[PDB]
Amino acid sequence: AGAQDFVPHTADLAELAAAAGECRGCGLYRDATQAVFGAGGRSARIMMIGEQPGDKEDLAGLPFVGPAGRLLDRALEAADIDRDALYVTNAVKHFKFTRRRIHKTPSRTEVVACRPWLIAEMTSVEPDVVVLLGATAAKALLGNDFRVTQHRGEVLHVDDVPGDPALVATVHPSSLLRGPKEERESAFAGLVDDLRVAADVR
Numbered sequence: 001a002g003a004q005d006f007v008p009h010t011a012d013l014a015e016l017a018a019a020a021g022e023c024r025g026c027g028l029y030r031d032a033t034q035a036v037f038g039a040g041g042r043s044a045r046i047m048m049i050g051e052q053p054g055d056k057e058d059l060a061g062l063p064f065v066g067p068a069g070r071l072l073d074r075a076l077e078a079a080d081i082d083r084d085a086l087y088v089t090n091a092v093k094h095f096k097f098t099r100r101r102i103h104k105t106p107s108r109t110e111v112v113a114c115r116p117w118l119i120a121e122m123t124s125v126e127p128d129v130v131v132l133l134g135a136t137a138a139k140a141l142l143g144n145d146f147r148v149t150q151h152r153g154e155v156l157h158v159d160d161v162p163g164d165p166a167l168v169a170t171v172h173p174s175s176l177l178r179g180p181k182e183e184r185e186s187a188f189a190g191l192v193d194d195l196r197v198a199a200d201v202r
């Protein structure tokens with residue numbers, strides 16, 4: 001019936017993560033190893049939200065540590081942003097997969113179920129800017145009909161979001177990895193640019 005009953009009313013990030021460890025909000029906690037809560041401290045100005053922990057993250061207990069995360073770090077270095085100044089997290093907290101462990105897009109039901117954790121992280125960190133990496137992260141805050149390819153690199157502000165942070169959407173780093181090698185320099189320039197829009201929001 002949602003993560004809501006499993007969410008403590010606290011701004012402490014460590015208490016949130018520990019309690020996320022006990023969530024039975026949707027079925028995703030069954031096959032994953034552990035919940036992967038975000039990383040960073042409350043002092044961060046910029047929050048970055050991906051889709052879900054992948055194979056590596058599920059085992060490392062940290063978000064964006066696999067290939068997608070390595071590419072994301074290269075894009076951060078190129079955008080002159082430091083990762084330790086950020087708060088990084090995911091729309092869904094448990095890794096969803098089929099049988100190598102193969103990575104399955106979270107369903108809308110799962111996304112709505114896990115959203116209370118994300119709201120809690122936002123009320124705590126109070127970012128000035130949220131960066132949405134990919135479609136599922138973006139739909140999570142902007143509705144089921146939000147299309148990233150149409151609105152990428154635009155400073156968005158929406159009513160319902162806690163704190164009225166600017167919101168900037170972009171492609172998930174793993175889209176670049178999955179894309180053809182010949183477009184990778186233009187796609188990467190695309191991600192780096194959207195990140196610089198977020199960083200240049202005052």
Ligand SMILES: O=c1cc[nH]c(=O)[nH]1
Nearest residue numbers: 050051052054063064
């Ligand atoms: O933390 C992660 C890792 C891979 N993909 C994501 O969306 N988030």
Ligand code: SF4
Nearest residue numbers: 023025026093094114
């Ligand atoms: S995914 Fe989000 S909701 Fe479903 S179980 Fe893990 S934490 Fe609870």
